[PDB]
């Protein structure tokens, strides 16, 4: 139990609706300059869920579970900014009205918040159904570690990640440690609070692991995410969550939402067999 400002934090209604499956072209362009016709992002994805492999799908940018978009452009920034991984989500219209889930991730660009509901719910949902996220976590501070920034994470979920304070150093279980040069699309976004960015590994063996799963906790080496996304800084480290599937185009791959950032003197990622948010929700 780290000391935080949890009691100072503001909890607020963030609304959206279930997003349709989205495609701007039938074709996805590969790194080899070839075209494939495959499903992409958005929608209710019936057979890909948090906890599944990010790899091995005939798809691109596939978002697990339910994708939630804004009612209109003006409402995209708060949706994307305030929604934190692990926040409670309630279905507010349609046949699954009253059903509860949790935020697994968010994806910038199209600006989707990604949500896990129990399987039985998914078959009752419809594109356009109203969604309430009870947004809570931005503003979170570690009072004993002011140089370690945290974000994008529900404070109750934060306490279940196996993070231990030992000797003024913050030990964090991770499945993999990713070099700065493996990060691609999304570097330079205005705020790490409001988007993911991509690990451009075409295969999980490129990251030194047999598999990378949606919901996995990873370390990003030599990236500072305190403000904008993806600042290369030797000795910086970031901790994040894997939020979407593998991708076919140059510079893309499984998305990561940052939950912690600071110096390698303070944050010690420790490689374990399993570290996945699906285990706690």
Q: Which residues 203-262 are close enough to bind a copy of itself by CB under 8 A?
A: 222, 224-232, 249-252
Smaller CB separation from K ion, 78 or 269? 78
Burial of 56 (0-12, 13-18, 19+ CB in 10 A): exposed
Strand partners, 12: 135
- x-or-dash pattern for a copy of itself, window 151-170, by CB under 8 A? x-------------------
Residue 104 interacts with K ion (CB under 5 A): yes or no: no
Do the beta carbons of residue 163 and residue 268 sit within 8 Å?
no
Residue 94 interacts with Cl ion (CB under 5 A): yes or no: no
Residue 71 is given by DSSP the state: S
- x-or-dash pattern for K ion, window 40-69, by CB under 5 A? ---x-x-----------------x---x--
Owner of token pair 């057979």: 47
37, 208, 263, 270: residue in contact with a copy of itself (rule CB under 8 A)? 37
Residue 273 is given by DSSP the state: S
Q: Which residues 61-80 are close enough to bind Cl ion by CB under 5 A?
A: 64-65
Q: Which residues 253-272 are close enough to bind Cl ion by CB under 5 A?
A: 266
Q: Which residues 81-110 are close enough to bind a copy of itself by CB under 8 A?
A: 81-82, 92, 95
Least separation in angstroms between CB 214 and a copy of itself: 13
Q: Cα–Cα–Cα angle for 74, 258, 279, nearest 5°?
A: 110
Residue 97 is given by DSSP the state: T
The three-state secondary structure class of 218 is: strand
Residue 116 interacts with Cl ion (CB under 5 A): yes or no: yes
Residue 132 interacts with a copy of itself (CB under 8 A): yes or no: yes
Count CB-CB contacts under 10 A for residue 42: 23
Sequence-distant (6+) residues with CB within 8 A of 238 are 219, 220, 223, 224, 225, 258, 260, 261
185, 204, 243, 269: residue in contact with a copy of itself (rule CB under 8 A)? 185
Sequence-distant (6+) residues with CB within 8 A of 273 are 175
Smaller CB separation from Cl ion, 116 or 231? 116
Residue 145 interacts with Cl ion (CB under 5 A): yes or no: yes
Of the candidate spans 112-120, 122-130, 208-216, 273-281, the one that interacts with a copy of itself by CB under 8 A turns out to be 122-130
Name the residues that contact K ion, by CB under 5 A.
43, 45, 63, 67
């Amino acid at each position: 139990h780290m000391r935080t400002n949890k009691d100072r934090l503001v909890r607020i209604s963030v609304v959206g609706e279930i997003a349709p499956a989205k495609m701007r072209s039938p074709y996805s362009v590969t790194t080899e300059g070839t075209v494939r016709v495959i499903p992409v992002l958005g929608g209710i994805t019936y057979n890909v869920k948090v906890g599944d492999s990010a790899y091995g799908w005939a798809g691109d940018h596939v978002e697990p579970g339910v994708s939630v978009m804004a009612r209109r452009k003006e409402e995209e920034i708060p949706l994307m900014t305030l929604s934190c991984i692990g926040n409670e989500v309630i279905v507010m219209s349609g046949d699954a009205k009253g059903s509860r889930g949790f935020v697994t991730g968010k994806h910038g660009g199209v600006n989707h918040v990604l949500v896990h509901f129990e399987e039985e719910v998914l078959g009752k949902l419809m594109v356009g159904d109203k969604i309430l996220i009870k947004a809570w976590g931005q503003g979170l501070k570690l009072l004993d570690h002011p140089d370690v920034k945290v974000m994008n994470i529900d404070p109750d979920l934060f306490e279940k990640l196996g993070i231990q304070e030992k000797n003024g150093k913050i030990h964090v279980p991770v499945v993999a440690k990713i070099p700065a040069h493996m990060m691609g699309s999304g570097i330079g976004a205005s705020s790490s609070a409001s988007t993911d960015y991509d690990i451009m590994a075409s295969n999980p063996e490129d990251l030194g692991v047999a598999d990378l799963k949606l919901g996995d906790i990873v370390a990003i080496q030599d990236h500072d995410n305190s403000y904008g996304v993806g600042k290369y800084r030797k000795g910086a480290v970031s901790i994040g969550v894997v939020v979407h599937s593998a991708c076919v185009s140059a510079g893309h791959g499984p998305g990561v939402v940052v939950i912690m950032t600071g110096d390698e003197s303070k944050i010690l990622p420790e490689e374990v067999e399993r570290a996945n948010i699906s285990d706690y929700l």
